[PDB]
Symmetry: C3
Subunit: 399 residues, 3 copies
């Protein structure tokens, strides 16, 4: 679709071509982050700090459960009730309906309250009544079992209490850091698996492993941050927040590719100029449009986004990319650093009056006219060239 | 202020309304972060590493004290002398004046040098001579008391020295990570309580607790990053930096609200279009202006900023919001992901030709004319509507 | 270059003058991040988890070695080969050539495979065959020696296995977090020393120390993120990734300075206005150009950038800074927070119709006409002044 010859004459060079992927059809698994740990090994010396920690956990989980109930009541009443909400965007109403649909798994999790409380190690997998599986997180119990139980004989009782109080304070701080935006807005906020794992020593590989997935396998999903987490249920007395973590599938957009453009400085009457274009241009069947690659993720061979994220292009840029190059944006190179050459289709295009161009077959400098912008380098005249510092071999123009 | 009817006809929907808050009248408390810890218990095996760490701390703290002794004497000379400072912005001169005003607390801290040095646990509160209270941070001493002292019988002397050297290097690295911008510009740089706590295992709840504030009650200040810290005094021989932490009060701006606008796709002759506006618009008594919500923090009911940040609005955009909708910024949709419906004051506004609309109330579809942009759904015709995937009940227009 | 008098009359104040530095002529040193640790003290109880971790490391390192071998074969087949690569930018070709040039050090590292495997502490320095020195990282072995060996008698065999499995999973997660963008693109991706140290408990001072540089002396390079790392060799069976770290020298750009400008509100007919200009303006011998200070680093006396980054300047802004102030961009103030005064050349410039201005010598209000924008305060009339809340002494304009 792009007019590559005119763009090369203006100094715009075809780059890599990527596939394009969108989140779709997510699969979900359950996870319970227990805020009040099981401390049966050190229960005697932690009496004062544990009650304070329980009160602090209750004071931060009560508004969360109140906000969850204020959302469930709206749906349970009727179908979201457009009167009870008053105002919201489409995403909020969709999230509320999804939360009501997930209330069944919330009740299934709440059925396992005693088994959740009786977990006595860092990560445990429990068989749910619906034949599902959920992961229990007991980060403090890992700290206890690793740092206090092996040395329980040496430490005095007051020292144990102080150390466990510091550990509980640290875990509360980490929860407030990661789950902070979620506890203030439970129905809308989604937390990535890395941010969720930040309360578990940033060990997201262990979280993925216990839920059935090897971290090296899902890297196209994990890298783009598509493994989200959403609050499903909060119990203020048992002290846990349970999450439903998505593992979305990626669908190939039909007949859509993402094209990379590499800019090259070109000379006009001795002066260096760079043409200003988006570095990524999305090509559909009959349309050409921008793509905000910052909010997406660029992999080795594909571009992954959670939504379509396609944006229209100005008529000037459309004309620039379709062959009317007089309308392209361009700026003077007062800097000393710009790419003076690039390699595409086995041919190196270089700006030979602003950088040196030499042949190795005969050590003579090739001349490019002041009446042309970028010179084509290929096997028709010379076989291996030196541009700037580097010297590379080159294919043929006939290809 | 806003003309909601014309905006709805253009596809702009009234959202949530927030209060507006600004930092004002801060209260201050003192903390002493000690770089050179008390090392009693392992002093014999750490002789080589401790002296090297002391020299490194001296080398990193001497330029800080040199700069502090500058701005202070600049005031002590006279009032900030304009001849000695040569060039400075208003914030720098105000910060220097505040530093001189806090030099009294700096001297009070320096009076407690022996007690600060003799602290032998992670966090200790000392009664100052002015009846003030300050918090001592001894992060390495906590690491020692938790990891070396309980197993002091098993470790050989060389292993203790190597491990404590690694711990000292780790803490010095964390100090350079957090206080790095501060130690090269002490009078201007302000460090948030989370970034300060990053040298204390990211445990800011412990820092707030020892200084008298519960983290769960202080969230409206803590979340927006208004709990800052400023260098007040550095002692190169005792090896500590003393910080003064602000706990500002939030003032309600008189008769000022922040209005959220949510965009909705609207159709003209079959094509999807989205109107571009700021998502947050600030409304004063008789003025309308933008607000940089990126710098601010949006809570569940209010917007919190350290400065008012009331940027002005373009004349075209002002005309667009006040009723002249012909001048609004308008953009074609070339993406599958655009919000097609929104819910406000019990009514739902939807694009029924670019997404499906039906009446679950009477099992009939909902056609809107091609001559209108956005259709109004209310209880005049059907009681329950289905828009897209999701179906919602709806209030009445007469309200 | 800049016309400071007209800018002051428009409300633009001369600021600090900084030097300007660019990366150049880097020195390189080697390190080896060992992915598969030596755990011989706990080998019996960790047999199940260690074999799984070995397979995970192999699965995560095989594509990296394949990608490195592809780039090496594109060069050993000659000087890069334009036909084999097909398409790439200049940076990629330069990086591939540098990788082939560093293949000699890669082979030298691979010569020391048994010595690398047999190391048994966190950091060890090995004498390479080329008289070079390299640093080995064994982060898991540090965790073992600090947390498992001292309490090896108390822990049961199953508990040791579970704990070391959790530790190995944690290290794998940390490696995927830091080296993630590198393992998916080895030839191009460069990693800062802090990000590399994030797999070693964020202890970059220890990494710099073993390789021969004190962190305090190297802060000028370290702060700007110029200490990069590049993948040099991967061994999928021995389980390590070898990195080459650049310690670049900083070159003073000849006769180039970076100028800072304070914006100052000025009044025309009662209304506050702010002139919109870049906060940093670069001045060469005969040119004036913008500088992207966001990508650069501003120190106390100099600006450090990895590239020139001298962007061109608009004609209107050039005319504004060169004396044609009618073309300056100006903005109405509808905000309560604007800097109203600035100090430069010992002379304070203030907008006295929007803030109070007094002398303390006569204690009488300072009056500026509505027909002038900003007023000059100097020793010709009063010796000490008060502007707003703060009162400052001032120098003499007559000098």
């Amino acid at each position: 679709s792009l007019h590559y010859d005119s763009l090369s004459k203006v100094g715009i060079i075809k780059g890599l071509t990527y596939n394009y992927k969108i989140k779709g059809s997510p699969s979900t698994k359950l996870m319970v982050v227990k805020l009040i740990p099981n401390i049966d090994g050190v229960r005697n010396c932690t009496q004062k700090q544990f009650d304070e920690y329980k009160n602090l956990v209750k004071n931060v989980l009560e508004p969360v459960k109140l906000a969850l109930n204020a959302m469930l009541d709206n749906v349970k009443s009727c179908c979201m009730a457009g009167v009870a909400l008053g105002v919201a965007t489409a995403a909020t109403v969709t999230a509320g309906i999804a939360l009501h649909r997930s209330n069944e798994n919330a009740q299934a999790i709440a059925n396992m309250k005693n088994a959740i409380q009786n977990t006595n190690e860092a990560v445990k997998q429990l068989q749910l009544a619906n034949k599902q599986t959920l992961a229990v997180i007991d980060t403090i119990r890992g700290e206890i079992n690793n740092n206090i139980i092996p040395v329980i004989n040496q430490l005095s009782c007051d020292t144990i209490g102080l150390s466990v109080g510091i550990k509980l304070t640290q875990y509360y701080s980490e929860i407030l850091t990661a789950f902070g935006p979620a506890l203030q807005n439970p129905v809308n906020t989604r937390i990535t698996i890395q941010a969720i794992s930040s309360v578990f020593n940033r060990n997201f590989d262990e979280l993925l492993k216990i839920m059935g997935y090897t971290s090296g396998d899902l890297y196209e999903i994990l890298h783009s941050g598509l493994i989200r987490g959403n609050i499903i249920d909060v119990d203020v007395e048992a002290g846990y927040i349970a999450l439903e973590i998505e593992f979305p599938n990626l669908t190939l957009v039909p007949n859509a590719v993402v094209q990379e453009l590499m800019p090259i400085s070109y000379n006009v009457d001795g002066d260096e100029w760079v043409t200003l274009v988006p570095r990524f241009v999305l090509t559909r069947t009959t349309l050409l449009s921008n793509i905000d690659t910052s909010r997406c993720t660029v992999t080795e061979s594909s571009v992954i986004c959670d939504n379509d994220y396609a944006l229209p292009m100005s008529y000037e840029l459309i004309g620039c990319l379709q062959g009317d190059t007089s309308k392209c944006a361009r700026e003077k190179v007062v800097s000393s650093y710009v790419p003076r050459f690039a390699l595409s289709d086995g041919l190196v295009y270089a700006n030979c009056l602003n950088t040196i161009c030499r042949c190795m077959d005969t050590d003579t400098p090739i001349s490019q006219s002041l009446g042309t912008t970028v010179s084509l380098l290929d096997n028709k005249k010379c076989l291996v060239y030196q541009v700037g510092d580097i010297l590379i071999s080159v294919g043929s123009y006939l290809g």
